[PDB]
Structures are given as structure tokens and as C-alpha cells.
């Protein structure tokens, strides 16, 4: 037969579509909700080993992620279009802050498919490969 080498190639540019599909409000809500439940216990455990500066940022991410989950669980399809937008904008703003605060620990993201991971510097666009404004589910 031929050489073994199928299944992988250049899914890189497609990954933003997959990432946007997965991290849509649909799945993003439960995924964030699960991590928010886990965040405090993780922090409490590593709190002794966690730098004061780092610990704080992680608390903000936990708090912000909670708000986002709260919004979706407190959302109704019966709300007006301006409400759908308003909650989204507020959530998006919160998302912008938390992504700027740092990514959650990989252990806490160990329920996500290894690859769609989130690097703070990459999120901060401090050192992006294209530098065009590559995002996750944002742009
Ligand atoms: C580019 C968009 C970002 C970083 C906002 C969405 C993601 C986060 C906030 C980080 C945690 C999210 C998941 C584990 C889905």
C-alpha cells in the first residue's frame, strides 16, 4: 500500500470556524459554567503556591466568567432584540476584560479539545503570527 499520512494537513484557517462554532453562546455557556464552578476550588488548592499578582488576575477571570454564565442562564428568547444585543455587548465587554486578564489554567481547560487553547499574549495580540487581528470568536 501507500505511505501512512492522512487526516492532518492545514486545518489552521478552518480552526477559527470550528472555534467560533464551538465557543458560540451555545457551548460557551456550559463550558464557562463548568470552569467557573471549578475555578475557586483550583485557586483555593494552589492558593499557597500562587503568586499574589497571578492569584488576583485569576479571581477576576473567575468573577468575569461567572457574570457571563449568569447572563445566559438569566437570558430569555422573549427579550427584545436590543436586549439580545445589549447582553451580548456587556458579555463581550466582560470577555474582552477576562481574556486580557489571562487564560484559565490548562487543568481547568482540560475539558477542551487540545488545540483551540488560549494564550494571553496571543489574545492580547502582543505577538500574533499575522498581526491582522486574529481572534477566537471575537472577530
Ligand atoms: C478570542 C476570544 C476570547 C479569548 C474570549 C473567549 C475565551 C475565553 C474568555 C477564555 C476561556 C474560554 C473557554 C475555555 C471556552
Amino acid at each position: 500500500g501507500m505511505d501512512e499520512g492522512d487526516g492532518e494537513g492545514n486545518i489552521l484557517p478552518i480552526m477559527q470556524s470550528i472555534m467560533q462554532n464551538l465557543l458560540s453562546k451555545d457551548v460557551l455557556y456550559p463550558s464557562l459554567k463548568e470552569i467557573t464552578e471549578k475555578y475557586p476550588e483550583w485557586l483555593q488548592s494552589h492558593r499557597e503556591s500562587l503568586p499574589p499578582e497571578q492569584f488576583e488576575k485569576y479571581q477576576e477571570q473567575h468573577s468575569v466568567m461567572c457574570k457571563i454564565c449568569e447572563q445566559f442562564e438569566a437570558e430569555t428568547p422573549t427579550d427584545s432584540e436590543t436586549t439580545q444585543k445589549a447582553r451580548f455587548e456587556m458579555v463581550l465587554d466582560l470577555m474582552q476584560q477576562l481574556q486580557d486578564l489571562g487564560h484559565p489554567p490548562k487543568e481547568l481547560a482540560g475539558e477542551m479539545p487540545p488545540g483551540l487553547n488560549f494564550d494571553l499574549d496571543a489574545l492580547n495580540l502582543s505577538g500574533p503570527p499575522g498581526a491582522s487581528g486574529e481572534q477566537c470568536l471575537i472577530m
Side-chain angles (χ1 to χ4, degrees), residues 23 28 31-32 35 65 95 98-99 103-104 109 112 118 123 135-138:
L23 307 188
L28 185 67
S31 306
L32 296 185
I35 298 177
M65 288 170 67
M95 292 179 63
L98 100 86
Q99 63 183 89
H103 64 86
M112 312 296 293
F118 311 75
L123 302 182
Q135 288 296 273
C136 331
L137 40 151
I138 310 296

Side-chain angles (χ1 to χ4, degrees), residues 52-64:
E53 54 175 88
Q54 182 64 92
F55 186 85
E56 292 180 69
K57 313 177 80 70
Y58 282 153
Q59 297 291 329
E60 296 197 73
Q61 299 156 32
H62 175 216
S63 302
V64 169

